[PDB]
Amino acid sequence: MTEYKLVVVGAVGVGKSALTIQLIQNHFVDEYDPTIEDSYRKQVVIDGETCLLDILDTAGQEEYSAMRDQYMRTGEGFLCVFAINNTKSFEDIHHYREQIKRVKDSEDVPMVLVGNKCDLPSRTVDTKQAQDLARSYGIPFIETSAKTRQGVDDAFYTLVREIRK
Amino acid sequence: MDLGKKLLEAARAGQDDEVRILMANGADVNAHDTFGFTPLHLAALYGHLEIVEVLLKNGADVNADDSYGRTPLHLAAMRGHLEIVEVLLKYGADVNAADEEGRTPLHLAAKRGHLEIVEVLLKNGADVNAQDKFGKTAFDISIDNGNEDLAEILQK
Ligand SMILES: Nc1nc2c(ncn2[C@@H]2O[C@H](COP(=O)(O)OP(=O)(O)O)[C@@H](O)[C@H]2O)c(=O)[nH]1
Ligand SMILES: [Mg+2]
Structure with missing residues (x-):
């Protein structure tokens, strides 16, 4: 069976760990320590x-x-x-x-843009602004909530689909 | 009064005074956050040797594990905190403890390239050949990473 090496990147506190754990364990974490860098695995x-x-x-x-x-x-x-x-x-x-782009040495690398915490009522970052950036990069944009599981499988699924292409 | 939160925070932050005081007023050395981190996990993860000791000497559980199955030893290995790995063992940490994926501290150290910790875990009876739940062993990890120095340790 095929193995995909997925990297989850982004600023501290955006919900990267909360996304990883919701995907593999089917559970939301408030408080997950912000410096633990582990590689979790999941058969799907x-x-x-x-x-x-x-x-x-x-x-x-x-x-x-x-x-x-x-x-x-x-x-x-x-x-x-x-x-x-x-x-x-x-x-x-x-x-x-x-x-x-610099580490991979390539203008075209499989990537997905994820706008996490969409379960939240106040939003400072517009859907159009995010859609325009993904559209300028030529990559998918998916809204996610690590709390409600909304778009979580979709984000990880779409990335696997992008590697196949 | 919730001195469990006040103790965890102190353990993470390396404030050995606040830890001493907090326990003196009956704060529980096996407090845990909503994901099962004890003060010992945090002290180990963040490299705080005096605190790790004072927690153990005060009866902290050394083989406590978070909701993904990691002992404080796992985390100490993860980070490459060598002197901590040793004292966790000296106080009865399970070398071959396996997390929800089946990874032992040897797998985690091997995977990060922490060769000094790999050497020491083996010397305390780590099982070179233990497979995680996907089949992988330390030697799979060395070849998967092209790590020559690790693959050498795992034979001669
Ligand atoms: N409401 C909401 N909170 C989230 C979401 N994802 C993460 N959080 C919270 O934000 C904090 C940061 O999550 P964390 O996974 O530590 O992000 P990391 O620092 O990128 O790994 C935690 O308290 C989470 O409970 C989400 O999708 N919705
Ligand atoms: Mg994190």
């Missing part, structure tokens, strides 16, 4: 092909990581996560996309 069925997900949930980017750099060189898809209530996280997408 995507479009009739049993396949294995090997997801790195980046944390602690402040400090250096041997295994994080190795995941970045080798990784196959990227989830670029921002929070819909954090304008700084949206701005940081620019730096993450550019960093991926």
